[PDB]
């Protein structure tokens, strides 16, 4: 008859318990200590300006109404019980669509200590908003947040605090990173207050700092475009009497350049403003176009001013590579110092 | 035992949540508010836009007034199913959802005199038919309508509060191609098979940003048409050179023409972008056909073809410049 004690303890625990009222309704401002363990920093979708994150959200607080005395010090409770006591109604301010996992059973735990302290852990995937400034794409670093707090309880009723020093209260698993196009440099945590028409509310924020990887864009956009420009310029070392060769060469180079530009922009999401990749694309495309038109001028001035035709061929030969080299130096320096 | 517990237990005693306050006396008057967290992406393909709001409603329920020393009850989402709640719905929403993590995101506050405040967080995929003429130089202002589902004008009347609909930053919003310009709110009565209903509207003025489209479509197309112009300045005996140049410009133009409309629904009218791209393609076509005709006539009327070469040199750039001028002035005017 050693289980009757626990069943009676649990049955009495809720006797005369009102879960519409926060703990410490007439004594305190309820104080919830929060901790987040990021099991995996999910993928970041720059198309949707969002990122996914899977966390073990641990919230603790005190409930004098649930003090108990018995053989056990810490008491395990089930979802049917946790649904009958008051729990903080935390929500994610920038959350889009979060799922609480319930297979094979709800992924929640509720522990009570003899002194009335509760620990409520929940495993849940959060899809949160990641407002992205893609001006320096593909060299852009983002710091987009995870902000949570209470709905319906102002700072005069419920206040959140980090259970440990703030920097150590958000912990990312070593193998958590599920990112393939970004790199997680670290995070910063903070607290704050948000003013609404219904009062002031406590906000707990965490910024995860990301840095985009460049190797893919280099090896699949930048090098093909640079080499197409190089070809367009290679046109100049041929002879002027090879008119069909020069014309087909230039026109097919422009065709390849349009193909590359279409592919690159189709890769990037549809943002209506200019990114570093767009600047590179446009400048290289301008170089190809200018080489073709310069050849046209050389061909025109042939048969009528051969001296000037040769002079301009030599001048273009000398100048265009210098302009392209200077542009590359300036562009890469200005976008890598940042 | 506790004071507030007794107040709540007394309030809920003898309460029928199936009957609106004043079910047979006068219409329930509900004041409404909105705090727009964000306006998500506007996809013209499906003719919808996402919006995230905090939606608040206030009304008087004479059965919810108490006489304690406490002035206001501050509550969770636990009592929302216990008291009567208006059945407000969004008339033009393809799909909407409330938020449930970690706890239902509702709020309830009952005042001493029976006044009730109810707030919930919503995400709405509102529908609006975008007149896609002048695209990409198009402006839109499309609504969010809501009303009661079952209570006609004689039971429920909605009314906007002084400063009801408010927007937040507008800097972090996910409006890719558009730019929030302003909002307006309206009231109307709409007749239905069920009855007359007070319909409340909020309008959001969205202006497209050329940006993406202008760069990708307009500049490459213009330079491709200029390629045929430069072709004009080569020679008459350079037959393979001119023919290859014209055909490859045609191929490049055809490649370009497809991605212009990949950001558009399958609308069966002509947009500004489509007109521009088609005109450019016709310009390239006409340049190559002109060279073909000149090469044919080189054996018939050399004296006439000599005039024709320079005549084309003159006309083609001038015609394209006039087309640009008229096109841009007319569309930017609209």
């Amino acid at each position, epitope marked *: 008859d050693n289980t009757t004690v626990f069943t009676r303890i649990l049955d009495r625990l809720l006797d005369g318990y009102d879960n519409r009222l926060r703990p*410490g309704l*007439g*004594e*305190r401002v309820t104080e919830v200590k929060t901790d987040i363990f990021v099991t995996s920093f999910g993928p970041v979708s720059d198309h949707d300006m969002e990122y996914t994150i899977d966390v073990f959200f641990r919230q603790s607080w005190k409930d004098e109404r649930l003090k108990f005395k018995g053989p056990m010090t810490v008491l395990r409770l089930n979802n049917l019980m946790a649904s009958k006591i008051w729990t903080p109604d935390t929500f994610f301010h920038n959350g889009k669509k979060s799922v609480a996992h319930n297979m094979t059973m709800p992924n929640k735990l509720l522990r009570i200590t003899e002194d009335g302290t509760l620990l409520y852990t929940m495993r849940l995937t959060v899809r949160a908003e990641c407002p992205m400034h893609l001006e320096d794409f593909p060299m852009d670093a983002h710091a987009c947040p995870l902000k949570f707090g209470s709905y319906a309880y102002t700072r005069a*009723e419920v*206040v959140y605090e980090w259970t440990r020093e703030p920097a150590r209260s958000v912990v990312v698993a070593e193998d958590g990173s599920r990112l393939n196009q970004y790199d997680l440099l670290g995070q910063t945590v903070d607290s704050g207050i948000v003013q609404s028409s219904t009062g002031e509310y406590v906000v707990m924020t965490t910024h995860f700092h990301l840095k985009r990887k460049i190797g893919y864009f280099v090896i699949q956009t930048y090098l093909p475009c640079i080499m197409t420009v190089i070809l367009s310029q290679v046109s100049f070392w041929l002879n002027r009497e090879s008119v069909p060769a020069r014309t087909v060469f230039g026109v097919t180079t422009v065709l390849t350049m349009t193909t590359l530009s279409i592919s690159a922009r189709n890769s990037l999401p549809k943002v209506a403003y200019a990114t570093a990749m767009d600047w590179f694309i446009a400048v290289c495309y301008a170089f190809v176009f200018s080489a073709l038109i310069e050849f046209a001028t050389v061909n025109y001035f042939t048969k009528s001013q051969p001296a000037r035709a040769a002079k301009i061929d030599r001048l273009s030969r000398i100048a265009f590579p210098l302009l392209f080299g200077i542009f590359n130096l300036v562009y890469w320096a200005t976008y890598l110092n940042r | 035992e506790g*004071d507030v517990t007794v107040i709540l237990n007394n309030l809920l005693e003898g309460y029928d949540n199936k009957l609106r306050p004043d079910i047979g006396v006068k219409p329930t008057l509900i004041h409404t508010d909105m705090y727009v967290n964000s306006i998500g992406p506007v996809n013209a393909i499906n003719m919808e836009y996402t919006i995230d709001i905090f939606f608040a409603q206030t009304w008087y329920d004479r059965r919810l007034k108490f006489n304690s*020393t406490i002035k206001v009850l501050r509550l969770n989402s636990n009592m929302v199913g216990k008291i009567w709640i208006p059945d407000t719905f969004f008339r033009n929403s393809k799909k909407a959802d409330a938020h449930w993590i970690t706890t239902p995101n509702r709020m309830l506050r009952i005042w001493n005199d029976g006044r009730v405040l109810y707030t919930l967080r919503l995400t709405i995929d509102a529908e609006c038919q975008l007149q896609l003429h002048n695209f990409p130089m198009d402006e839109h202002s499309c609504p969010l309508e809501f009303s009661s589902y079952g209570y006609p004008r004689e039971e429920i009347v909605y009314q906007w509060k002084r400063s009801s609909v408010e927007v937040g930053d507008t800097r972090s919003w996910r409006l890719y191609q558009f730019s929030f310009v302003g909002l307006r709110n309206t009231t109307e009565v709409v007749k239905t098979t069920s009855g007359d209903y007070v319909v409340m509207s909020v309008y959001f003025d969205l202006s497209r940003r050329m940006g993406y489209f202008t760069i990708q479509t307009y500049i490459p197309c213009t330079l491709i048409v200029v390629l045929s112009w430069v072709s004009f300045w080569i020679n008459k005996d350079a037959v393979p050179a001119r023919t290859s140049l014209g055909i490859t410009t045609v191929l490049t133009m055809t490649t370009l023409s497809t991605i212009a409309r990949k950001s558009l629904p399958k609308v069966s009218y002509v947009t500004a972008m489509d007109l521009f791209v088609s005109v450019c393609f016709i310009f390239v076509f006409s340049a190559l056909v002109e060279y073909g005709t000149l090469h044919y006539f080189v054996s018939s009327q050399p004296a006439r073809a000599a005039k024709m070469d320079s005549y084309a040199r003159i006309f083609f750039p001038t015609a394209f410049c006039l087309f640009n001028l008229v096109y841009w002035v007319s569309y930017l005017y609209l």
Partner: T-cell receptor, first 109, second 116 residues
Framework: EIVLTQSPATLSLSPGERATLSCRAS??????LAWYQQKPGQAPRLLIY???NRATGIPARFSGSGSGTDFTLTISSLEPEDFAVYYC??????????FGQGTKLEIKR | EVQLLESGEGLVQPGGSLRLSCAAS????????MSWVRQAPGKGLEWVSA??????????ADFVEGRFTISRDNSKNTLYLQMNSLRAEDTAVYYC?????????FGGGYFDYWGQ
């Protein structure tokens, strides 16, 4: 922490005029600001609570407004007995309760 | 009808002790949070300590480093303040003030009534 500052430190006015007392807080105290009147030789009396609501039995000439960090108390048609010291009190987290230094409202002759 | 009556007046030598009591009548004593406010001679009002309406929770100002202790008895309808390790800076008129009940903080933020 929260520090309430009342300006002016004194306010010299004559009966029948319109007075304005300002209490400015270092950080936001939301709507939790109250105004008290202490006629010398007596205990304080509540005038305005929650920054806008008049207490029970207060003549309608006492009005208050504000929110956040800037609050104001306005007396219209100063009666002779409305000359006293006025305090602003705030309810917050870091200091539970706190009073302003007080504003002494005297007669102008 | 409401009546708060402070008592315990008396001289004290520095480092001494004193027990102020405030007898309340005319209202339900166990529903209101009560507080102690002191005014030094020629100075402004200053809040000393507050006790919940059930006596469970107590709050003290910064200047009282664990020296005072507030208490109440709902059976006697009385509010107490035991003072210890006093100082000459502690001279003042001490008021008991009652705070209305509310679901925010541990009562409305203000004092609805004051003692003499």
């Amino acid at each position: 922490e929260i520090v309430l500052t009342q300006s002016p430190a004194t306010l010299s006015l004559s009966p029948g005029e319109r007075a304005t007392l300002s209490c400015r807080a270092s950080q936001s105290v939301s709507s939790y600001l109250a105004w008290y009147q202490q006629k010398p030789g007596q205990a304080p009396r509540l005038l305005i609570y929650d920054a806008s609501n008049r207490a029970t039995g207060i003549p309608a000439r006492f009005s208050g407004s504000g929110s956040g960090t800037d609050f104001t108390l306005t007396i219209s048609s100063l009666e002779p007995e409305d000359f006293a010291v006025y305090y602003c009190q705030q309810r917050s987290n870091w200091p539970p309760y706190s009073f302003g230094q007080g504003t002494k409202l005297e007669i102008k002759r | 009808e409401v009546q708060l009556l402070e008592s315990g007046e008396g001289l004290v030598q520095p480092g001494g002790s004193l027990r102020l009591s405030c007898a309340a009548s005319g209202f339900t004593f166990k529903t209101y949070a009560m507080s102690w406010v002191r005014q030094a001679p020629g100075k402004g009002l200053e809040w000393v300590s507050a006790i919940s309406g059930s006596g469970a929770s107590t709050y003290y100002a910064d200047f009282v480093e664990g020296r005072f202790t507030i208490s109440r008895d709902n059976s006697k309808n009385t509010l107490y303040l035991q003072m210890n390790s006093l100082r000459a800076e502690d001279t003042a008129v001490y008021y008991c003030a009652k705070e209305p009940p509310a679901m925010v903080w541990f009562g409305g933020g203000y004092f609805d009534y004051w003692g003499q």
